[PDB]
Each structure stands twice: as C-alpha cells, then as structure tokens.
Write a protein that binds this ligand. Structure first.
Ligand SMILES: *[C@@H]1O[C@H](CO[C@@H]2O[C@@H](C)[C@@H](O)[C@@H](O)[C@@H]2O)[C@@H](O[C@@H]2O[C@H](CO)[C@@H](O[C@@H]3O[C@H](CO[C@H]4O[C@H](CO)[C@@H](O)[C@H](O)[C@@H]4O)[C@@H](O)[C@H](O[C@H]4O[C@H](CO)[C@@H](O)[C@H](O)[C@@H]4O)[C@@H]3O)[C@H](O)[C@H]2NC(C)=O)[C@H](O)[C@H]1NC(C)=O
Ligand SMILES: CCCCCCCCCCCCCCCCCCCCCCCCC(=O)O[C@H](COC(=O)CCCCCCCCCCC)COP(=O)([O-])OCC[N+](C)(C)C
Ligand SMILES: *[C@H]1O[C@H](CO[C@@H]2O[C@@H](C)[C@@H](O)[C@@H](O)[C@@H]2O)[C@@H](O)[C@H](O)[C@H]1NC(C)=O
Ligand SMILES: *[C@@H]1O[C@H](CO)[C@@H](O)[C@H](O)[C@H]1NC(C)=O
Lengths: 99, 270
C-alpha cells in the first residue's frame, strides 16, 4: 500500500544567529521508495542539498536523510517540502528552532 | 551484540524499466552502498572489506553481479506470467553476532511493502498469509539447488565470517565515543497557561543515551523522550520535552548521561 512520509527538521548544532550550522530533514515511514525532497530558504529552493542513500527499517518502510548548510537568522525561515505518490499536495514542515 | 543487514530495494515500473540499489549496515554505521548504475559495490568505510582478501572479496562480488542481473530478469518474467495481472520488492539479509561467536542468519523478502518469503534452513518458504500465487514460483526456485547451496553458504558461513572481520577491521569506528552537545528552548502547548520545555541533545555516539528533566534530584517523570534522529556526520539527535505550568519552569534543569562523558553529566539549567 501507500505509506505516507513523516518529516522532521532539526539543526545539527544549537542554532545561533549569524553562525554556520547544518539543517537536517529526516523523512521517514514512507512507501513506495520514490520521492523528491526539497529544502527551502524563505520559500525558495536550496540547490545544494546532500542526501543519504535510501534505506528501510525493520518494518519495511523507507527513510532518507537530507541535509544542507545554513546560517540561521532572526528572519530567514526554513522548511522541507516532500513530493510523494501517497499524497495529493506536497507536505512542508517548517524548521522551528524553539521546537 | 551486532546486527549486520544487507538491504536490497528493487522497483519495477514497466518491462522497459526497473532498478536495484542496495545498502548494508553494521548496526548504526553503513559499510556499503551499491547503486544500480555502478557495476561494483562501493565501500563507505575504510574497513568495508573486513578481512577477506581482494581475491576473496572479488569472488563474492562476482557472485552478486551475477545475482543482480539474474534477479531482475527472473522477476520480470515472473511479472509476465502471474496473478490476475498486477512493483516494489525488498530483501533484508544478514546475521546477528553474539558473545560466543554465535549468530542467527536471516533473509526476508517483502513484496509491495509486505513480508512474504524468507529463506529458512535449506529451502525458500512462503510465509503464512502470503498470496497463493507465490507458492508455485517459490517451488520452482526451490528446484534450483545451486542457489540453495549458495544461499546456505552465504548465511551459515560467509555472514558470520565476514562480519567478524568487520568487527575487528572497524573497531575504532564502532567503539567511537562522540560527545553530545545540548541546548534548551520552549514553546506554548495546547493547554492555556502551559509551556513545553525542550531539551535538544545532538552529536552523540553511540546511540544509547539518557536525558531527563530534573528539579534538583527529583526526576521529572513527565519527561517525554522523542525519537532518535540521525545526523549526517554519523551521530545521533534526540530531544526530551516537558510540559509545565508557566513560571513552574523555575529551578528546573535538564541533564544528560552518556558513555562519552565518563560519568560527568551535562546539566543545562533554565
Ligand atoms: C545451514 O543452516 C541450516 C540451519 O540454520 C538455520 O537456517 C539458516 C538458513 C539460517 O537462517 C540460520 O541462522 C538458521 O539457524 C541447516 O538447516 C538444517 O539442516 C538439517 C539438514 O538439512 C535439517 O534437518 C532435517 O530436519 C527434518 C525435520 O525438520 C522439522 O523439525 C525440525 C525440528 O524438530 C525443524 O527444524 C523444522 O522446522 C521441521 O519442522 C528431519 O526430518 C530431517 O531428518 C531426515 O533427513 C535426514 C538427512 O539429513 C536424515 O538424517 C534423517 O534420518 C531423516 O531422514 C533432517 O534432520 C534442519 O531441519 C535444518 N534446519 C532448519 C532451520 O530447518 C542447513 O543444513 C545448513 N546448511 C549448510 C550448507 O551448512
Ligand atoms: C547474504 C549475506 C551474506 C553476507 C555477504 C557480505 C557482502 C555483502 C555486500 C554486498 C551487498 C549485496 C547486495 C545484495 C543483497 C543480499 C541478498 C543475498 C541474496 C543471495 C542470492 C545468491 C545468488 C545466487 C544466484 O545468483 O542464483 C541465480 C539467479 O537466481 C535468482 O534470481 C535468485 C533470486 C532470489 C530471490 C528470490 C525471490 C523472492 C520472492 C519473490 C517475491 C516477488 C541462479 O540462476 P540459474 O542459472 O540457476 O537459472 C537457471 C535455472 N535452472 C538452473 C533451473 C535452469
Ligand atoms: C516506464 O516508467 C519509466 C520510469 O518511471 C519513473 O520511475 C518510477 C519508479 C516512478 O518514480 C515514476 O513516477 C517515474 O515516472 C518512465 O520514464 C518510462 O517512460 C515508462 N515507460 C513505459 C513503458 O511506460
Ligand atoms: C539498472 O542497470 C541496468 C544495467 O546496469 C540498466 O539497463 C537499467 O536500465 C538500470 N536502471 C535504470 C532505471 O537506469
């Protein structure tokens, strides 16, 4: 069947303004294993995004880690948009430093 | 204990189109990758060859190179003559090491995300509840004894053998200790007046970790531990939320125990 992705977006280090960091987008629990993942800075797409090889858990569902380099600021908001057959509209999960 | 897994994932879209990409792991750390478009199996670690010689490795690699093309070709034919007429298939194979050079080997196949066949002892086996039409294929395949002897060598023999080699070869990587850095934050909850304190802990290795909201020495047992989330530099991310009455934040600390700290815990105060 079609299992839909769950998406998590978390920094590598404690985020601090003006300070280079890494932003992870862990996508999980989906099937089939065909997906486009985008990472966004202020709605615009980030071209430079590196990705783990797709793998799957004991429970057969696939998971993949995307990450990019980013300098968090007061104003720049970040997110992760996922394209996937199990879903009419793309999902978008906004980075939230406080969360 | 250590689980060694070879995960294969193959998609068939058409009869024109299909691809197989594998990745293998030794617990946390990936040892290999093998893309459909690469003719050979990449090493994601310096020790990904374990102890086997170039000879011995290449022997095993040739065997997989044959298996991959075969698997594809066989499955495509299985597609033609089948079901009424219906693809995503997955293999998880390997072994689990134990104190006394003991292990249980395994090989499971999932079709359309559902577990359907495993290899057990000497023959392939449709698992209970699987579609009837697999019975025949699984029998035909069981007529090819070469592949059953082959598969038995790989499970009973090669798996423990190789993995033992990996454990020695990779020792420093698997016994790495990487220290967690921790930070605090909070967000409002649904409940009015209530806030959610969060304890983010990132960069630790190995996985097992302990993160508790404390008030002095009273373990705050409302502490809810999230899922373990992977960083890309092969370390772990976890966070623990504690919901609280506004102002009830006062005098609270989150502490973290972890192998890598000796026994000198981290203790961010709020
Ligand atoms: C590789 O290891 C195999 C076992 O290991 C497991 O499976 C592998 C693939 C991994 O997953 C590993 O981690 C697992 O632990 C090993 O298979 C074993 O070998 C023998 C011979 O092939 C099998 O023995 C025969 O069993 C049947 C009855 O089986 C039933 O009952 C038993 C227990 O009571 C259960 O295990 C089964 O589920 C069945 O319900 C006997 O009737 C039969 O006796 C007859 O045949 C023999 C000929 O050998 C004669 O001597 C007798 O007189 C009888 O005529 C056998 O005793 C054993 O079942 C099988 N284990 C399993 C799991 O079924 C395989 O041989 C190894 N191969 C190599 C190349 O190293
Ligand atoms: C196994 C783990 C051991 C550890 C090894 C360490 C190194 C690993 C690093 C590299 C990772 C490899 C990635 C692959 C994943 C591992 C899976 C292990 C598979 C072992 C296969 C052995 C190959 C033998 C072989 O090539 O046989 C050949 C091809 O057969 C297959 O396709 C095997 C398919 C197995 C899957 C069954 C389908 C499951 C249910 C389907 C549901 C839809 C035999 O060809 P043949 O010549 O016998 O065909 C003619 C038939 N005949 C003789 C009757 C006339
Ligand atoms: C056959 O399918 C090809 C590949 O399809 C793509 O890959 C699959 C796994 C999905 O990700 C799917 O959404 C993609 O489109 C096509 O490019 C090809 O044109 C198709 N041709 C036929 C015979 O239908
Ligand atoms: C996978 O590899 C085979 C041969 O290496 C090739 O013909 C096939 O088209 C590849 N898969 C895709 C979708 O490129």
């Amino acid at each position: 069947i079609q299992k839909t992705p769950q998406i998590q977006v978390y920094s590598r280090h404690p985020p601090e303004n003006g300070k280079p960091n890494i932003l992870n987008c862990y996508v999980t629990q989906f099937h089939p294993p065909h997906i486009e993942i985008q990472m966004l800075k202020n709605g615009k797409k980030i071209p430079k995004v590196e990705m783990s090889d797709m793998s799957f858990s004991k429970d057969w569902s696939f998971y993949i880690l995307a990450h990019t380099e980013f300098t968090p600021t007061e104003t720049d908001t970040y997110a992760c948009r996922v394209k996937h057959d199990s879903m009419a509209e793309p999902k978008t999960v906004y980075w939230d430093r406080d969360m | 204990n250590y689980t060694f897994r070879c995960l294969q994932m193959s998609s068939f879209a058409n009869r024109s189109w299909s691809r197989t990409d594998s990745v293998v792991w030794l617990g946390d750390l990936q040892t290999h990758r093998w893309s459909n478009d690469s003719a050979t199996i990449s090493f994601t670690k310096p020790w990904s060859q374990g102890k086997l010689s170039n000879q011995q490795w290449e022997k095993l690699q040739h065997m997989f190179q044959v298996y991959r093309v075969s698997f594809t070709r066989d499955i495509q034919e299985l597609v033609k003559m089948m079901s009424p007429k219906e693809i995503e298939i997955q293999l998880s194979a390997g072994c689990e090491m134990y104190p006394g050079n003991a292990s249980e080997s395994f090989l499971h196949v999932a079709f359309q995300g559902k577990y359907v066949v495993r290899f057990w002892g000497t023959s392939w086996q449709t698992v209970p509840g699987a579609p009837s039409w697999l019975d025949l294929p699984i029998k035909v395949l069981n007529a090819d004894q070469g592949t059953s002897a082959t598969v038995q060598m790989l499970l009973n023999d090669t798996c423990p053998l190789f993995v033992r080699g990996l454990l020695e070869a990779g020792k420093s990587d698997l016994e790495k200790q990487e220290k967690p850095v921790a930070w605090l934050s909070s967000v409002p909850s649904s409940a009015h007046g209530h806030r959610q304190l969060v304890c983010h802990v990132s960069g630790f290795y190995p996985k097992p970790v302990w993160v508790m909201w404390m008030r002095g020495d009273q373990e705050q047992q409302g502490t809810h531990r999230g899922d373990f989330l992977p960083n890309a530099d092969e370390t772990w991310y976890l966070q623990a939320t504690l919901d609280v009455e506004a102002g009830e934040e006062a005098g609270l600390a989150c502490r973290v125990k972890h192998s890598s700290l000796g026994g000198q815990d981290i203790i961010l105060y709020w």
